Design a protein around this nucleic acid. Structure first.
Ligand code: K
Ligand code: K
Ligand code: K
Ligand code: K
Ligand code: K
Ligand code: K
Ligand code: K
Ligand code: K
Ligand code: K
Ligand code: K
Ligand code: MG
Ligand code: MG
Length: 1332
RNA sequence: GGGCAAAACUCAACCCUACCCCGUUUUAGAGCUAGAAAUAGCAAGUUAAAAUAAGGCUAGUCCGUUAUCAACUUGAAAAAGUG
DNA sequence: CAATACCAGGGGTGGGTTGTGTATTGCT
DNA sequence: CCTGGTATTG
């Protein structure tokens, strides 16, 4: 017979269905294997495979990087110790041993328990002298005396082990370190530019004001308030704001045209500033330079909170200041508490559980938690004003190793280390000879372009070696072929040209590439004037003239410039009409202008002889971000430029890559013409062919060479092909499961390929939205965050999120919005919900009243646009509002929405265009249709139809085949069945639609695509449609409105649906990552081989990879008498390899004896067992079970629950709304009935006596509640019966905690069921037959 | 119209390298006084070492948490096969 | 033995890719 | 968050 397949692909489920030409679901007798008495079973050909979500490779990669980092840090310490080996041997022959075994307890220590000095007196004396490591570091930096080699090692090792970040390149340039010295020089330069309006900085304490621990805006205010007649938005105020790290706008200071927002931290900044400089010149260059220097000094004084006069170890001195102030403040706080709150001293200083000082030090309290706990204690006390201020500045009782130490650059640690080396090399000759080695150990970092230093056993590595010896930081340049390794980095990184697959893609900012884009756009530009009959192309001379006169003198070329600056000036046209370009030219020559500003040699740029050198320069600037490598590759061109241009160029940086190779653009030439693609793009007579026309023109060579070039390589497997698809790994796991389901379904139907396969794909935090708001107000320069504090979780509500996105302003009315009145306010859809279902914040907007939007059918009225356009663009620059949202807000000025707009919105709602769905369709099509005809065209025996969820959702809502997701998992299978039905019927009714729905090769649309699915309806908003629905041409019947609806209903009401939870071996981390303290418990796992957890603590809570059923004997009692057992042993992920290498030895080491090797059953997670009365359990672990049954609630109750709970929308037909409400009230008794159907189920399968009794009491409690709320809570009640892991749920206000199945003893005598992917093929094993 | 390409603006999803900072764990940093002793009173507290998936062989300044997996007949395996 | 309350490593820096809609020029 | 491990508690 003939049949079709319906599929619903999700992130966790693949629903599948088989239908006949009558839209019926077949049933079949399937053979049952095993050792049970049942040999076959009847099954319906509907079901749904369920699985756990597929995970990305991000967490694995981060674990891998942390692993490599720990390894290499240990290697750094090893290098330092090998350097110190021979002399430390003379000083202390067991020092490094004591350091290595510092973790062991004294019982296991092979040496003295005191690490540094091997005796208690010297150790205690050391600690008294240096309370922290930073004391010793500063001392070794400053003191002139010879020091103990062990203390030198400790200081250098602490500097190398925690060496600081690498965000700053080169040396730190410590001549401009003082904030006052740079602020005074900034005042000098500013007064230089303005002799008439100077600023007197006398008595201005810039050090205290600018280095204070306050917000940047507050420090700006405090500095400006010290300058009378000067304001914060003046030029000097904006310069100070730029130095503090803010985003000033210099547009108003220089009477500019548009925004000149600067910020030193943005990567664009350089360009930005130089852009700005073009407006006013180079007089202000060194002014902004002085501002940047002042900013660097402030960034340093943020870290080096100590003056640099007395010491050369400012970091260690700042740490010592922390320690001393902590000591003073702690002494004072204890004295104060003894004075006024001696009742609370012990809780504060002895209680670790409380967030006092004790928990802050010994417990688990954090600095923030400690501040919150002790702030009211300080406020209630007297004499704590200084301590209170210190708390508010986040600077009280501070430790030295804190979270904010991440801003410390490595050059600071390097300065202190180099100072110690200089001091102590006068006494230790090996320190003098190895100074640069020890410095290298701190500075050297494996380059980003080299990767893992592997030797042929790493799938991540790509490095090649000049010689075959061990790589150290010192011999790196001699062992590693940096040239070939960087070349391989390039090859691994860059995409290939698709037309020429053996050629690399040009950089996105290549001069040749932007020339290509400009000429390709400019070629298809036509123009017309009065004395012209027809618009004409530009000639080659015209195009070269427009390039030389406009594209090489202005970064952007506007149509206005094209008309006035070219056609008026050269062609003498008073008027002209341009076509092919609107507003401005998308393409431009930005790289040309960059290199023009840098090299200052327009002739050098315009010489065809310099094409190769400039291309290589741009390539080098795009490949790398490393200063060393960039400097290295531009040395061949060092003779052509001076040092100033060379430095400017070294700073020039680019990212991104094009999509075409250079051999395609200006390499291959037409055989006849001898011209390249770019040659035609510059001049093609009057034809003016562009890139597409140039590679698709049979008249010229290119197409032939392209076809000669392309190669279809060695084909991927199915799994490989799916993996290489663009998309999330979850949906790709779903796709692979879909293909396997389809394979097995074809196998079930006697290997007969179906006629149709309908596929549907489901379309489907706090920190990122808080980040949006945080950056948005920062850019806006507003203070609403200051006025209204809000936590990240509070943004679960969408109204508050929209509010803080809108800066207190109303989006349709220029009026402030009230925080406390947020209840009344209205969330409106920019493009309305009637036309588009976009419930995202992108089509959402918070306003005082919906009315103020203007009319509803169109986009907000032109008046509202004219009003709020500036505020909308300001929110767009702050990125609080996206460009899509902005364009939708202002569409009225462009005419609102056209008829084509609405028609296309509908068509996109109905036709799927998502690429991943097309890829799945391609895979299924290429697997089903494999033969060719006499014309060698593909034989499409199977048709792959693709649907969007709105079709079947609307079908359910129209004909009341409602879905309730929380009842069971049948809705996936039902979605698949309805997909098959609707797709098949739709393409039967309208074959012309195949173009839109099958894979392979005025206002009319608004009515057509909105009425395509009306042939199911009997009545219409007039004419009654025929009860029988046929194809107009073939006459074949497509839909019987008297029977096929009944068929769909009978199919949806079927209780037997093949729901299969995919059994899976667990993978990932061995256990919880927490390192637990020591404890007397055999659940603790040692973190090292010899670290007994009873002494050293360790891990617990491992993940079971899979359980194993063991039938064996164990020793019982002192006599060790063998007693027979049959139990579940969970093999952990960590034990899995050793178990699989030899299971017998593994089990015997566990204590089992005489193991029946052939009765060992591997049981992954979710293994299915059946017990009595059809009760089913799934394996959640070796010692816990999940619910294994589905509640097949009758369709009547599903529809009643949908309607009574107001599950989605109300029908919108007032008569029909009253119809449905009357049905709900007439069938109210269903409530009780539903409960009964649950109770019975729970009594037969769930077996939670206490939970069921509490649920029944709760249901009887709220019997006078409205029907809608009782139904909405009955919807929750299905958590008790849902398949899978138990969960807690609320019925009204009563909470029902999950009942767990903490024992797997019963499944050992149950029936184990092995199901195929559809669950149609089974193997049933009676486990009670094993053991004895 | 369906598929496709490049440019412009855009946001979502993914893949990879080199590093940084905390956290946790054990040990070290002589607790004192009064008691037989339980215990009570006070003193102190900020730091470091070392581990940071057990570990593996290929012994690399490498690898170790992604993807893939019902059962059965083969095969050592990858694979094929069975209702 | 089974019921049950508690708990689960976090933050930052670089690069590359496909796909998303909007609209320009085009191929097929 | 979800859901399985874990110690408490009878
Ligand atoms: K991390
Ligand atoms: K010992
Ligand atoms: K002032
Ligand atoms: K703490
Ligand atoms: K444009
Ligand atoms: K770069
Ligand atoms: K896995
Ligand atoms: K997993
Ligand atoms: K299975
Ligand atoms: K893109
Ligand atoms: Mg390790
Ligand atoms: Mg630490």
């Amino acid at each position: 017979k003939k049949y079709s397949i319906g599929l619903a692909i999700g992130t966790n489920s693949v629903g599948w269905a088989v239908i006949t030409d009558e839209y019926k679901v077949p049933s079949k007798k399937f053979k049952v294997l095993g050792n049970t008495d049942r040999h076959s079973i009847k099954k319906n050909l509907i079901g749904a495979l369920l699985f756990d979500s597929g995970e990305t490779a991000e967490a694995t990669r981060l674990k891998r990087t942390a692993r490599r980092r720990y390894t290499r840090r240990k290697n750094r310490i090893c290098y330092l110790q090998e350097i110190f080996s021979n002399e430390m041997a003379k000083v202390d022959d067991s020092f490094f041993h004591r350091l290595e075994e510092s973790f062991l307890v004294e019982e296991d220590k092979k040496h003295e328990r005191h690490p540094i000095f091997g005796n208690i007196v010297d150790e205690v004396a050391y600690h008294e002298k240096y309370p922290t490591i930073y004391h010793l570091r500063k001392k070794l930096v400053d003191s002139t005396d010879k020091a103990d080699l062990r203390l030198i090692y400790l200081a250098l090792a602490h500097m190398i082990k925690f060496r600081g970040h690498f965000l700053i390149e080169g040396d730190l340039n410590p001549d401009n370190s003082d904030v006052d010295k740079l602020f005074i020089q900034l005042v000098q330069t500013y007064n230089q530019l303005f002799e008439e309006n100077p600023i007197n900085a006398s008595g201005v304490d810039a050090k205290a004001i600018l280095s204070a621990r306050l917000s940047k805006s507050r420090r700006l205010e405090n500095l400006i308030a010290q300058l009378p007649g000067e304001k914060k938005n003046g030029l000097f105020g904006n310069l100070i704001a730029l130095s503090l790290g803010l985003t000033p706008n210099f547009k108003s200071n220089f009477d500019l045209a548009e925004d000149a927002k600067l910020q030193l931290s943005k990567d664009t900044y350089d360009d930005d500033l130089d852009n700005l400089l073009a407006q006013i010149g180079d007089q202000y260059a060194d002014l902004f330079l002085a501002a940047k220097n002042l900013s660097d000094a402030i960034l340093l004084s943020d870290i080096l909170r100590v003056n640099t006069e007395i010491t050369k170890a400012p970091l260690s001195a700042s740490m010592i200041k922390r320690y001393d102030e902590h000591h003073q403040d702690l002494t004072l706080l204890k004295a104060l508490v003894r004075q006024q709150l001696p009742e609370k001293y012990k809780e504060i200083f002895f209680d670790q559980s409380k967030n006092g000082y004790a928990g802050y030090i010994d417990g688990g309290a954090s600095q923030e938690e400690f501040y919150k706990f002790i702030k009211p204690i300080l406020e209630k006390m007297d004499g704590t004003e200084e301590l209170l201020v210190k708390l508010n500045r986040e600077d009280l009782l501070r430790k030295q190793r804190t979270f904010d130490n991440g801003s410390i650059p490595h050059q600071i640690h390097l300065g202190e280390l180099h100072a110690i080396l200089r001091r102590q090399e006068d006494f230790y000759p090996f320190l003098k000879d190895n100074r640069e080695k020890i410095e290298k150990i701190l500075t050297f970092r494996i380059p980003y372009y080299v990767g893992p230093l592997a030797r042929g056993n790493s799938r991540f590595a790509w490095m090649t070696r000049k010689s075959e010896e061990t790589i150290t930081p010192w011999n790196f340049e001699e062992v590693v072929d940096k040239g070939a390794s960087a070349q391989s980095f390039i090859e691994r990184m860059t995409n290939f040209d698709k037309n020429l697959p053996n050629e690399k893609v040009l950089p996105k900012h290549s001069l040749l590439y932007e020339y290509f884009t400009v000429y390709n756009e400019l070629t298809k530009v036509k123009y017309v004037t009065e004395g012209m009959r027809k618009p004409a192309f530009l000639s080659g001379e015209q195009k070269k003239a427009i390039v030389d006169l406009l594209f090489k003198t202005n970064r952007k070329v506007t149509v206005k410039q094209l008309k006035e600056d070219y056609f008026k000036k050269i062609e003498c046209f008073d008027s002209v009409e341009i076509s092919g370009v609107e507003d401005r030219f998308n393409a431009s020559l930005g790289t040309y202008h960059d290199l023009l500003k840098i090299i200052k040699d327009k002739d050098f740029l315009d010489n065809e002889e310099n094409e190769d050198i400039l291309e290589d320069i741009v390539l080098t600037l795009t490949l790398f971000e490393d200063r060393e490598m960039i400097e290295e590759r531009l040395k061949t061109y060092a003779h052509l430029f001076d040092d100033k241009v060379m430095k400017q160029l070294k700073r020039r940086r680019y990212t991104g890559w094009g999509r075409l190779s250079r051999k395609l653009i200006n390499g291959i030439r037409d055989k006849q013409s001898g011209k390249t693609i770019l040659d035609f793009l510059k001049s093609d007579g009057f034809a003016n062919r562009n890139f597409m026309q140039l590679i698709h023109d049979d008249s010229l060579t290119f197409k032939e060479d392209i076809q000669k070039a392309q190669v279809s390589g060695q084909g991927d497997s199915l799994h490989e092909h799916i993996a290489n698809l663009a998309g999330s790994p979850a949906i790709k796991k779903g796709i692979l499961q879909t293909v396997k389901v389809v394979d097995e379904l074809v196998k079930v139907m006697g290997r007969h390929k179906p006629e149709n396969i309908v596929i549907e794909m489901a379309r489907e935090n706090s920190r990122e939205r808080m980040k949006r708001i945080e950056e948005g107000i920062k850019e806006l320069g507003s203070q609403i965050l200051k006025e209204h504090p809000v936590e990240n979780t509070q943004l679960q509500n969408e109204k508050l999120y929209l509010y803080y996105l809108q800066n207190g302003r109303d989006m349709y009315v220029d009026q402030e919005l009230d925080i406390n009145r947020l209840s009344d306010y209205d969330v409106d859809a920019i493009v309305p919900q009637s036309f588009l279902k976009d419930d995202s914040i992108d089509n959402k907007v918070l306003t005082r009243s919906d009315k103020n939007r203007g009319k509803s059918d169109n986009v907000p009225s032109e008046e509202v646009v004219k009003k709020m356009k500036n505020y909308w663009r300001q929110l767009l620059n702050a990125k609080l509002i996206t460009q899509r949202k902005f364009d939708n807000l202002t569409k009225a000025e462009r005419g609102g929405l056209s008829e084509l707009d609405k028609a296309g919105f509908i068509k996109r709602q109905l036709v799927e265009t998502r690429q991943i769905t097309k890829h799945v369709a391609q895979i299924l099509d290429s697997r089903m249709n494999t033969k060719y005809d006499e014309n060698d065209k593909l034989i499409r025996e199977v048709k792959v139809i693709t649907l969007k969820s709105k079709l079947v959702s609307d079908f359910r809502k129209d004909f009341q085949f409602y879905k309730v997701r929380e009842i069971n998992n049948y809705h996936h299978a039902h979605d698949a069945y309805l997909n098959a039905v609707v797709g098949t019927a739709l393409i039967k009714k309208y074959p012309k639609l195949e173009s839109e729905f099958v894979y392979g090769d005025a206002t009319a649309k608004y009515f057509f695509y909105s009425n395509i699915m009306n042939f199911f309806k009997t009545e219409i908003t007039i004419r009654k449609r025929p009860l029988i629905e046929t194809n107009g041409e073939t006459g074949e019947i497509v839909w019987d409105k008297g029977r096929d609806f009944a068929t769909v209903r009978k199919v949806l009401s079927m209780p037997q649906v093949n729901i299969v939870k995919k059994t899976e071996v667990q993978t990932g981390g061995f256990s919880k990552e927490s390192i637990l303290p020591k404890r007397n418990s055999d659940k603790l796992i040692a973190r090292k081989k010899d670290w007994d957890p009873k002494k050293y603590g360790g891990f617990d809570s491992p993940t079971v990879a899979y359980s194993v059923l063991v039938v064996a004997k164990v020793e019982k009692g002192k006599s060790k008498k063998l007693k027979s057992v049959k139990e579940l042993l969970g093999i952990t992920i960590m034990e899995r390899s050793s178990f699989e290498k030899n299971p017998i030895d593994f089990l015997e080491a566990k204590g089992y004896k005489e193991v029946k090797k052939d009765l060992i059953i591997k049981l992954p997670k979710y293994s299915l067992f059946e017990l009595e009365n059809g009760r089913k359990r799934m394996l959640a672990s070796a010692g816990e079970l999940q619910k294994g049954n589905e509640l097949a609630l009758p369709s009547k109750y599903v529809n009643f629950l949908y309607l009574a709970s107001h599950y989605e929308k109300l029908k919108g037909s007032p008569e029909d709304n009253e119809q449905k409400q009357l049905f709900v009230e007439q069938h109210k008794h269903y409530l009780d009935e539903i409960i009964e159907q649950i109770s019975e189920f729970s009594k037969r399968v769930i077996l939670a006596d206490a939970n069921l009794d509490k649920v029944l009491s709760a249901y009887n409690k709220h019997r006078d509640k409205p029907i809608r709320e009782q139904a909405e809570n009955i919807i929750h009640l299905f958590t008790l019966t849902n398949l899978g892991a138990p969960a807690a749920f609320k019925y009204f206000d009563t909470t029902i905690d999950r009942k767990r199945y903490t024992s797997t003893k019963e499944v050992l005598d149950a029936t184990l069921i092995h199901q195929s992917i559809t669950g149609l093929y089974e193997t049933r094993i009676d486990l009670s037959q094993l053991g004895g």
